[PDB]
Short mmCIF file of all heavy atoms in Angstrom, two decimals:
data_model
loop_
_atom_site.label_atom_id
_atom_site.label_comp_id
_atom_site.label_asym_id
_atom_site.label_seq_id
_atom_site.Cartn_x
_atom_site.Cartn_y
_atom_site.Cartn_z
N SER E 23 189.03 203.74 140.02
CA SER E 23 190.14 203.12 140.82
C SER E 23 189.77 202.77 142.30
O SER E 23 190.49 201.93 142.92
CB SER E 23 191.44 203.97 140.82
OG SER E 23 191.23 205.24 141.37
N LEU E 24 188.63 203.32 142.73
CA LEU E 24 188.11 203.03 144.03
C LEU E 24 186.92 202.06 143.92
O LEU E 24 186.47 201.58 144.95
CB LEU E 24 187.63 204.33 144.76
CG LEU E 24 188.75 205.19 145.43
CD1 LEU E 24 188.24 206.63 145.75
CD2 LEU E 24 189.57 204.50 146.55
N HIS E 25 186.45 201.88 142.72
CA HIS E 25 185.41 200.93 142.40
C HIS E 25 185.65 199.50 142.91
O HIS E 25 184.74 198.96 143.46
CB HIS E 25 184.93 200.97 140.92
CG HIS E 25 184.14 202.11 140.40
ND1 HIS E 25 183.51 202.16 139.16
CD2 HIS E 25 183.95 203.34 140.94
CE1 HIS E 25 182.97 203.42 139.06
NE2 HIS E 25 183.16 204.18 140.10
N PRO E 26 186.87 198.79 142.86
CA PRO E 26 187.00 197.42 143.32
C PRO E 26 186.93 197.37 144.81
O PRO E 26 186.68 196.26 145.29
CB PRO E 26 188.43 197.08 142.97
CG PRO E 26 188.82 197.90 141.75
CD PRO E 26 187.98 199.15 142.02
N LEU E 27 187.16 198.42 145.51
CA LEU E 27 187.16 198.45 146.95
C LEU E 27 185.73 198.39 147.46
O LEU E 27 185.41 197.67 148.45
CB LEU E 27 187.80 199.72 147.43
CG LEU E 27 189.26 199.54 147.84
CD1 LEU E 27 190.13 200.77 147.65
CD2 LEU E 27 189.37 199.08 149.34
N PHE E 28 184.72 199.01 146.77
CA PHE E 28 183.33 198.80 147.02
C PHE E 28 182.85 197.45 146.76
O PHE E 28 182.06 196.96 147.64
CB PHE E 28 182.45 199.78 146.28
CG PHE E 28 182.75 201.10 146.77
CD1 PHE E 28 183.45 202.08 146.08
CD2 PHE E 28 182.20 201.31 148.03
CE1 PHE E 28 183.59 203.37 146.66
CE2 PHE E 28 182.31 202.58 148.58
CZ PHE E 28 183.01 203.61 147.90
N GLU E 29 183.35 196.84 145.73
CA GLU E 29 183.02 195.50 145.37
C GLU E 29 183.41 194.45 146.43
O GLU E 29 182.60 193.60 146.76
CB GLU E 29 183.59 195.06 144.05
CG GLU E 29 183.08 195.94 142.90
CD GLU E 29 183.76 195.47 141.57
OE1 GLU E 29 183.41 194.41 141.04
OE2 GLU E 29 184.72 196.18 141.13
N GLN E 30 184.63 194.62 146.96
CA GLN E 30 185.06 193.85 148.09
C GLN E 30 184.32 193.97 149.36
O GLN E 30 184.32 192.98 150.10
CB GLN E 30 186.56 194.17 148.39
CG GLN E 30 187.56 193.58 147.41
CD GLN E 30 189.05 193.71 147.74
OE1 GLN E 30 189.68 192.74 148.14
NE2 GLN E 30 189.66 195.00 147.62
N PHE E 31 183.67 195.09 149.69
CA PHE E 31 182.90 195.32 150.92
C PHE E 31 181.66 194.47 150.86
O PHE E 31 181.34 193.67 151.73
CB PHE E 31 182.44 196.77 151.26
CG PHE E 31 183.53 197.74 151.22
CD1 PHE E 31 183.29 199.05 150.69
CD2 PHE E 31 184.82 197.44 151.65
CE1 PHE E 31 184.23 200.02 150.66
CE2 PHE E 31 185.80 198.41 151.53
CZ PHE E 31 185.51 199.72 151.07
N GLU E 32 180.89 194.53 149.70
CA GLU E 32 179.79 193.70 149.41
C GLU E 32 180.04 192.19 149.28
O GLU E 32 179.23 191.39 149.81
CB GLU E 32 179.04 194.11 148.05
CG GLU E 32 178.80 195.69 147.97
CD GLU E 32 178.32 195.99 146.56
OE1 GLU E 32 179.25 195.85 145.67
OE2 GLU E 32 177.16 196.46 146.41
N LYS E 33 181.18 191.78 148.69
CA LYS E 33 181.72 190.42 148.55
C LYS E 33 181.96 189.79 149.93
O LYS E 33 181.55 188.68 150.19
CB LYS E 33 183.05 190.53 147.78
CG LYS E 33 183.87 189.30 147.62
CD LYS E 33 185.16 189.54 146.92
CE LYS E 33 185.86 188.18 146.82
NZ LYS E 33 186.36 187.71 148.14
N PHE E 34 182.64 190.57 150.84
CA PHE E 34 182.96 190.10 152.18
C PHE E 34 181.76 190.00 153.07
O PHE E 34 181.62 189.06 153.85
CB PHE E 34 184.02 190.91 152.94
CG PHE E 34 185.32 190.97 152.22
CD1 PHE E 34 186.23 192.01 152.53
CD2 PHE E 34 185.73 190.02 151.23
CE1 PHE E 34 187.51 192.11 152.04
CE2 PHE E 34 187.01 190.04 150.73
CZ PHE E 34 187.91 191.07 151.08
#
Side-chain angles (χ1 to χ4, degrees):
Chain E
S23 60
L24 280 163
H25 291 190
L27 261 151
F28 297 107
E29 300 177 73
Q30 287 187 105
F31 309 142
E32 314 171 290
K33 175 183 180 289
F34 301 159

